[PDB]
With several copies, the nearest count.
Chain A
Amino acid sequence: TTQSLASVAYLINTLANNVLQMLDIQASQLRRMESSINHISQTVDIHKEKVAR
């Protein structure tokens, strides 16, 4: 039973760490995506004003 309890706790810890790591990289990718979208939106709006001028 002690061996089983130690193994179960070890499995839970590694799974939790892996999930947290996966979530963090996903958030980092999303933040990088947001910056690119903002740059594209800024580029579009300056392009439109030049045509209006």
Chain B
Amino acid sequence: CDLLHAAPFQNILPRVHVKEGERLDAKMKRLESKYAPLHLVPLIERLGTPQQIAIAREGDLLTKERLCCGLSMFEVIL
């Protein structure tokens, strides 16, 4: 549930509807461009103190990597 709320700031987009007349690549590129301002890392990189860049990178790494992405511990307990 926590990771679901971080999708907009991590360029994590869903599968948008595609009908006859347009291809997936064009629609995805347009949708990514629309939400480009929400993405955080390049916005800090283009302007911002190096300390801010490092903190943002570390925070992004911690948020994206979690224990439901292919990790369990019941086996270890057994």
A–B interface present (Cβ within 8 A): yes
Interface residues of A (CB under 8 A from B): 39, 42-43, 46, 49-50, 53
How big is the B interface, by class?
A: under 10
Binding site secondary structure of chain A: helix
Q: Is the CB of B62 within 8 A of A46?
A: yes
Enumerate chain A residues within 8 angstroms of B59, measured Cβ to Cβ. Answer: 46
Residue of A nearest to B51 (CB): A39
Q: Is the CB of B62 within 8 A of A49?
A: yes
A–B pairs, 12, beta carbons within 8 Å: A39-B51, A39-B52, A39-B55, A42-B55, A43-B55, A46-B55, A46-B58, A46-B59, A46-B62, A49-B62, A50-B62, A53-B62
Enumerate chain A residues within 8 angstroms of B55, measured Cβ to Cβ. Answer: 39, 42-43, 46
Give 1 or 0 for each of B40-78: 1 = CB within 8 Å of chain A CB.
Answer: 000000000001100100110010000000000000000
